[PDB]
Amino acid sequence: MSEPMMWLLVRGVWETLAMTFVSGFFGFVIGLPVGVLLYVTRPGQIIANAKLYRTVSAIVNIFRSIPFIILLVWMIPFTRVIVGTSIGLQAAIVPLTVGAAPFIARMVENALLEIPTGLIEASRAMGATPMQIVRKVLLPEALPGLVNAATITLITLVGYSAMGGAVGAGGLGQIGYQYGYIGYNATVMNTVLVLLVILVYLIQFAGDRIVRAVTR
């Protein structure tokens, strides 16, 4: 391997952790409240909206049903308008989080749905307010669930950020696209593979370590 390459990988390893973790964060700042407000609106729950649910549920399904690459490309104009660029590390983050929100919100609600409804009932009975019941009761109870989703989201975002390197998000994905496809060096491809696999096992192992840490 060329020394200018080793140093280039280390950008990507970074530009990968960057995209993946940042996209993740923003995706939760959105999907999380989306998820919560998808849980409540179902029949029987604290605020039950037949119609509000249907709307939010169809659109997440729409957004979720657009294969990420197609999301990214269709989003080129959006990105520039907001970022001022369609290119690079921070440009990637716009589509990359739009691609994460539907995964996340759906998961969050599915995690909330694991919580036995009698817990709500206890809570209202103590004179607890719908905000109180969320942050005081519901979220704490799915923390394992939610931390599980995070693990599963960040991993998803790696593959997403990698496919962003065909469209120039940079990162280890860019490096693979160039040196495994455009023109080929065996060594460079092979350490791209191996870097990515490790980033995932590490992301997986760590999450499990956190989820296993929550009390039974």
Partner: protein
């Protein structure tokens, strides 16, 4: 009257079809007393209890606790109201995430309280329920009863005037339901805490309840005191529940033979109610000697409900057409209720 439910009627539309959960149910729980509502599954127990709390909205009626009206009220008022009513549930409803300690404290956090009382209030309420050992444990670790103690202490956190019970012992074993009910019982006597109660188990009623309503299909069929319901039951259903608590089994072979049409070489099979006066009175032993009857006892139980003895017997009576007629009549004079279930 601590809590007052008046003409409570609740209807639901689930399906195409419309079910009536509760119809003109009315009951008053005098303060410092333990009130049971018993009935079959689907009678409206769960609804009825919930209305008091306005976890359910009574379609029409009045809900009055501590004199304070509830039905029409501000949601910010309903919170401070709910500080006065503790509640416990059949499925214990603890946060799996929190320690037994903090589980109790959560209602104390709902309105902001200094961390100092919380440490105080909680330690107390835990020494009360007998969990003081266990402050640091997680509910997944607890056995069934331990959970209900927690749930009780938790409902008692706000130091409420009224405790509600939703089938609260229904998932515990016979051994524990005795120890839970007697713990609740103390709190009622010691702190004078008012208790509303729902059960399908008459046993729960005769243990700790002062008053009892029998509910059937949204309706209250019998409303009297426990002493009065277990002694001189005014309803067939009422009898069914009572007859149950004392476990009284008329073997299949008897019901098969028993026929309301009288035959030759037949003796009457009759069931006998004893009230406190007649319970210790040797009315059967006497009745043999006097009326030269043979009393054949198919099963029988005596118990206590509300500080009053009572009991029931299924027997067949062996004697002369006159002798039998005579001794029956002597039991009626002595405050045995004699009811003839057929001939055999």
């Amino acid at each position: 009257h601590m809590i007052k439910l008046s003409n409570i009627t609740k209807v639901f539309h689930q399906g195409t079809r419309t079910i009536q959960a509760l119809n003109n149910v009315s009951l008053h729980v005098p303060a410092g007393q333990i009130y049971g509502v018993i009935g079959a599954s689907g009678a409206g127990k769960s609804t009825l209890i919930r209305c008091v709390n306005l976890l359910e909205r009574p379609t029409e009626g009045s809900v009055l606790v501590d004199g304070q009206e509830l039905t029409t009220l501000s949601e910010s008022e309903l919170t401070k109201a709910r500080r006065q009513i503790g509640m416990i549930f059949q499925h214990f409803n603890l946060l799996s995430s929190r320690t037994v300690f903090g589980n109790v404290a959560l209602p104390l956090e709902l309105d902001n309280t200094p961390k100092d009382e919380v440490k105080r209030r909680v330690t107390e309420l835990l020494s009360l329920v007998g969990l003081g050992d266990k402050h640091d444990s997680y509910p997944s670790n607890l056995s069934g009863g331990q959970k209900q103690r927690v749930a009780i202490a938790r409902a008692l956190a706000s130091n409420p005037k009224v405790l509600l019970c939703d089938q609260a012992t229904s998932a515990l074993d016979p051994a524990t339901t005795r120890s839970i009910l007697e713990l609740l019982k103390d709190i009622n006597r010691r702190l004078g805490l008012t208790i509303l109660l729902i059960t399908h188990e008459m046993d729960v009623v005769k243990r700790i309840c002062d008053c009892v309503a029998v509910i059937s299909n949204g309706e209250l069929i019998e409303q009297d005191t426990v002493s009065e319901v277990f002694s001189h039951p005014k309803t067939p259903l009422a009898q069914k529940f009572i007859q149950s608590t004392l476990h009284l089994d008329i073997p299949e072979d008897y019901q098969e033979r028993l026929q309301a049409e009288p035959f030759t070489d037949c003796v009457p099979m009759l069931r006998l109610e004893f009230t406190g006066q007649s319970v210790d009175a040797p009315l059967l032993s006497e009745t043999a000697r006097r009326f030269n009857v043979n009393n054949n006892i198919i099963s029988a139980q005596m118990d206590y409900a509300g500080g009053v003895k009572f009991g029931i017997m299924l027997t067949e009576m062996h004697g002369t057409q006159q002798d039998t007629q005579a001794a029956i009549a002597w039991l009626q004079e002595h405050h045995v209720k004699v009811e003839v279930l057929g001939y055999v």
